């Protein structure tokens, strides 16, 4: 079973049709379509555009077209050298890769007059670059205006994660010009396209993978809050390697495990009884919805445990260590919030995520803490 479940994890998409429509100008040498892809995170929009360009170059006259990744630049100069990277040559780029006019000068083809179109992968770093109205909106205006005289221009094939980019554009420029209009969206595919990509790559289907209906169950009950079926497939390969370790049963188990310790693994998160005690003490201080300081909750602990004589209370530093433990598992968050008493004062305002009902189970089972509920 190993060599399968190992190899299990090692055109194609239906989406390929749509962009193909928006690509008709590129396989007939016309000026390409004004393509500004947006996409919610997880859907693979980066890898979506990457499958696009990969197929487009493995399918095709001289065939040259590139797509560069804009991450560590924060400025519109060294980007276009990365397009000069396609020449495999050496020049003085410093200006011809910096200003829009110099860019137009920079893009008259040389070898055979096979049109070269430009693609910017992960513009959502240039889009998410320095201050908007100063450089990033300025860079967008510059790179985005296609006012060349030869219609064989640098037709941007852009990609942006958060839609706000189109809202940050100049209002006048976007409506009547640029790569903007085809603001194609790629909403999270529950099963209907991504699950079928899964099946089509899994044509060489291992014998007992498991119940396909439980597979689709996993697909839905994840994609509810998920955008990675391949990564859900990876937690599935981990499940089958659990089956191996013990030498789709356990997948509901592992979901109840990893997603929310509140279900059962909170008892692990609060393994020590003093942890549970301090947590219920925080819940008690919640009745005073104030700055849940170390001091507030600590004094509340002191009084409530002098009352309920379960144990001699902990030291200040001890309570510190306990709450830090509680924060390491993340069951309760803290933040060094600012109060204005003397100066900018930074004290731990905490917020618990647990509910007294999710305390009902986890406490009523331990009758020793119940003296404090």
């Amino acid at each position: 079973k190993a060599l399968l479940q190992k190899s299990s994890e090692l055109a194609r998409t239906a989406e390929y049709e749509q962009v193909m429509n928006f690509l008709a100008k590129a396989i007939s040498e016309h000026r390409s379509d004004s393509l500004y892809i947006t996409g919610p995170p997880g859907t693979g929009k980066t890898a979506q555009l990457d499958m696009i360009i990969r197929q487009k170059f493995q399918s095709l006259e001289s065939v040259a077209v590139t797509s560069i990744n804009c991450i560590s630049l924060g400025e519109p100069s060294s980007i276009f050298q990365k397009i000069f990277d396609s020449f495999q040559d050496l020049n003085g780029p410093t200006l011809q890769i910096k200003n829009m006019q110099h860019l137009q000068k920079f893009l008259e083809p040389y070898h055979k007059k096979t049109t070269f179109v430009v693609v910017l992968d992960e513009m959502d770093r240039l889009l998410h670059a320095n201050t908007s109205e100063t450089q990033s909106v300025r860079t967008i205006l510059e790179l985005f205006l296609l006012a060349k005289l030869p219609t064989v221009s640098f037709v941007l094939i852009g990609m942006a994660n958060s839609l706000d980019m189109k809202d940050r554009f100049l209002s006048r420029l976007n409506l009547d010009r640029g790569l903007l209009p085809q603001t194609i969206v790629f909403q999270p595919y529950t099963a209907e396209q991504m699950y079928e990509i899964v099946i089509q790559k899994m044509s060489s289907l291992p014998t007992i993978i498991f119940q396909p209906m439980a597979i689709k169950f996993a697909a839905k009950k994840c994609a509810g809050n998920t955008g990675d079926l391949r990564k859900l497939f990876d937690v599935l390969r981990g499940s089958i390697e659990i089956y191996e370790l013990e030498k789709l049963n356990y997948i509901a188990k592992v979901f109840s495990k990893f997603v929310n310790n509140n279900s059962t693994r909170t008892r692990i998160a609060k393994l020590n009884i003093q942890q549970k005690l301090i947590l219920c003490t925080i819940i008690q201080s919640l009745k005073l919805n104030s700055d849940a300081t170390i001091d507030e909750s600590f004094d509340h602990y002191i009084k409530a445990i002098t009352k309920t004589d379960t144990l001699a209370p902990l030291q200040r530093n001890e309570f510190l260590e306990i709450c830090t433990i509680l924060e390491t598992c993340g069951l309760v968050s803290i933040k060094k919030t600012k109060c204005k008493g003397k100066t900018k004062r930074f004290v731990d305002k905490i917020d618990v995520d647990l509910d007294m009902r999710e305390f009902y189970d986890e406490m009523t089972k331990i009758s020793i803490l119940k003296p404090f509920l």
Binding site: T38, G39, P40, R138, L163, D164, K166, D167, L170, S171, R172, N174, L175, D176, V185, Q187, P188, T190, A223, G224, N225, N260, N262, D353, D355, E358
Partner: protein, 328 residues
């Protein structure tokens, strides 16, 4: 204190807005504009004879000058007065004052090469110790003994611009306009223009004023500025790109918040909201609920106050529009 709030307004898409502004501003008062323009064009030889004495021509009067500015300058003044000198028509240095990216340093770096580089004055380039002002001082000492003819015509659109009006830029342009061989002509929009210049800067400018009112829509100037239309519609595109579970949960939210303009009284309590999103078997607990809620919150797509009211500040009309159009 029930005030008319711009929220309760008929919003207009950017396309309809742009297009109707186009129709109006290109057809509203055409015949008046052209009559006014053909009438005032007769003043152009008057401007010729006035600028013969280098009197910096400032232009006021309502309506945009930008169009008319480039019109008078590029087309009439420059080449005619160039021919009149006795050959490249004198480079028209247009200052996009409305553009807030103008800076004295670089524009003077241009100016320098525009002006006479008779000596290697680049040798006088130094540390940040501003050679703009010192070098322009030297340039003035030079021109004090040079012949009198315009060697460059600079024109500023909206001299009250967000950059030029900076007092440093203003003083630089003053000491510049002291030069005789240059013709200074500009315009503003700020009604408080005279607040800009003391008798020192006036002496530098020797401003002569002229009214020009043609009642333009300020096309380019409308571009750089921005108002609230330039939120409900912000979230309207967000919800167009989400997951079906988010669609359904926001559908339930919008029903229970629109049942009772979408006011705060009409919302729902998170207790009963969890009761519902658990009854119809959507939310497993409060943590996942608040998680799939903050995706709306982390873009400010719904309001919450206190009961535990989650109230959509978006209008009843726009809300039921979401229902009938994008949700159902």
């Amino acid at each position: 204190k029930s005030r008319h709030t711009m929220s309760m307004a008929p919003d207009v898409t950017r396309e309809e807005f742009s297009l109707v502004s186009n129709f109006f501003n290109e057809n509203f008062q055409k015949r008046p504009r052209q009559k006014l323009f053909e009438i005032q064009k007769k003043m152009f030889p008057q401007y010729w004879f006035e600028l013969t004495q280098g009197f910096s021509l400032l232009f006021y009067g309502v309506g945009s000058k930008r169009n008319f500015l480039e019109e008078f300058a590029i087309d009439y003044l420059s080449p005619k007065i160039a021919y009149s000198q006795l050959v490249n028509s004198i480079p028209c240095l247009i200052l996009n004052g409305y553009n807030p990216s103008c800076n004295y340093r670089d524009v003077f770096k241009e100016i320098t090469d525009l002006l006479v580089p008779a000596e290697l004055t680049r040798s006088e380039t130094k540390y940040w110790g501003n050679h703009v002002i010192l070098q322009i001082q030297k340039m003035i000492d030079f021109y004090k003994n040079q012949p009198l003819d315009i060697k460059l015509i600079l024109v500023v659109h909206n001299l009250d611009g967000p950059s030029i009006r900076k007092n440093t830029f203003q003083t630089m342009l003053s000491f510049l306009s002291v030069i005789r061989q240059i013709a200074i002509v500009a315009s503003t929009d700020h009604i408080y223009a005279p607040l800009l210049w003391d008798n020192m800067k006036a002496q530098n400018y020797n401003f002569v004023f002229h009214d020009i009112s043609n009642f333009e829509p300020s096309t380019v100037e409308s571009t750089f500025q921005d108002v609230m239309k330039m939120g409900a519609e912000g979230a309207k595109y967000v919800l167009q790109s989400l997951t079906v579970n988010s669609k359904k949960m926001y559908k339930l939210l919008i029903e229970t918040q629109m049942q009772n303009r979408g006011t705060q009284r009409t919302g729902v309590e998170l207790k009963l909201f969890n009761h519902l999103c658990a009854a119809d078997f959507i939310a497993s607990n409060e943590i996942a609920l608040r998680s799939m809620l903050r995706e709306f919150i982390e873009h400010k797509m719904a309001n919450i106050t206190k009961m535990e009211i989650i109230w959509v500040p978006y209008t009843y009309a726009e809300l039921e529009k979401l229902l009938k159009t994008v949700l159902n």
